[PDB]
Enzyme design. Structure first.
Site, mmCIF file in Angstrom:
data_model
loop_
_atom_site.group_PDB
_atom_site.id
_atom_site.type_symbol
_atom_site.label_atom_id
_atom_site.label_comp_id
_atom_site.label_asym_id
_atom_site.label_seq_id
_atom_site.Cartn_x
_atom_site.Cartn_y
_atom_site.Cartn_z
ATOM 1 N N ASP B 25 0.839 -1.200 0.000
ATOM 2 C CA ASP B 25 0.000 0.000 0.000
ATOM 3 C C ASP B 25 0.862 1.233 0.000
ATOM 4 O O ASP B 25 1.419 1.572 1.052
ATOM 5 C CB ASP B 25 -0.780 -0.034 1.300
ATOM 6 C CG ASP B 25 -1.449 1.292 1.617
ATOM 7 O OD1 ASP B 25 -1.349 2.258 0.843
ATOM 8 O OD2 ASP B 25 -2.112 1.425 2.665
ATOM 9 N N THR B 26 0.920 1.915 -1.127
ATOM 10 C CA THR B 26 1.819 3.086 -1.303
ATOM 11 C C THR B 26 1.274 4.441 -0.764
ATOM 12 O O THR B 26 1.952 5.488 -0.840
ATOM 13 C CB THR B 26 2.139 3.223 -2.770
ATOM 14 O OG1 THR B 26 0.898 3.547 -3.342
ATOM 15 C CG2 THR B 26 2.709 1.949 -3.354
ATOM 16 N N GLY B 27 0.062 4.381 -0.205
ATOM 17 C CA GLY B 27 -0.578 5.474 0.564
ATOM 18 C C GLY B 27 -0.055 5.524 2.018
ATOM 19 O O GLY B 27 -0.090 6.589 2.667
#
Ligand SMILES: CC[C@H](Cc1ccccc1)c1cc(O)c([C@H](c2cccc(NC(=O)CCNC(=O)OC(C)(C)C)c2)C2C=C2)c(=O)o1
Lengths: 99, 99
Positions: B25-27
């Site tokens: 998850d790059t958030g």
């Protein structure tokens, strides 16, 4: 664009003739924007993040250009920490996770 | 691997002996794993997301095998609803986000 994660995956989205910044988020299923004025009717939604649930407004077939790429789809407007482009919009612009 | 985001980007990870499923998850700036037992000493911390803030116990320099690749870095342990591998180890495994 090939983007690295040394830093927040932030982009500029154009929704409504406005420039906003958003995070590219693969953990995110839908696209969640901070509060704003969008066209048409909405429905109600409850998405759950890390801190619990918030209830959002769902807008359909919304036009959002993300880094010069035009997507059209569902946007959810609500009390989020930041503007999230979710997997729903990531797949329309041909986004890939790579390693 | 090149991964598509039509499906949630789930990986098996091996942490402190055990295999687990986590969401790439790059958030997320930080890797937050659901309540487990990590050897060593930990500093309390509060991180926010969509929904608000949660209380976490931050262990530092934990070794982890996300799809074969060993990363070192800080894992937080708290009531995250899902195990989340964030930017802090992604970079470590040469993850990029491409479109
Ligand atoms: C787990 C899914 C859910 C979002 C979701 C779920 C389903 C459908 C749509 C969206 C989800 C994904 C996500 O990547 C996050 C993000 C998140 C996830 C894990 C950890 C953090 N916190 C950190 O990384 C450290 C502090 N950062 C931080 O405060 O950032 C903000 C933006 C709040 C200022 C933040 C959030 C910042 C947007 C989250 O809160 O919740």
């Amino acid at each position: 664009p090939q983007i690295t994660l040394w830093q927040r995956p932030l982009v500029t989205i154009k929704i409504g003739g406005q420039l906003k910044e958003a995070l590219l988020d693969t953990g995110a299923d839908d696209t969640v924007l901070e509060e704003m004025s969008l066209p048409g009717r909405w429905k109600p939604k409850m998405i759950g993040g890390i801190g619990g649930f918030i209830k959002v407004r769902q807008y359909d077939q919304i036009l959002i250009e993300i880094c010069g790429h035009k997507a059209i789809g569902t946007v959810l407007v609500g009390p989020t920490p930041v503007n999230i482009i979710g997997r729903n919009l990531l797949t329309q612009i041909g986004c890939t996770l790579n390693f």
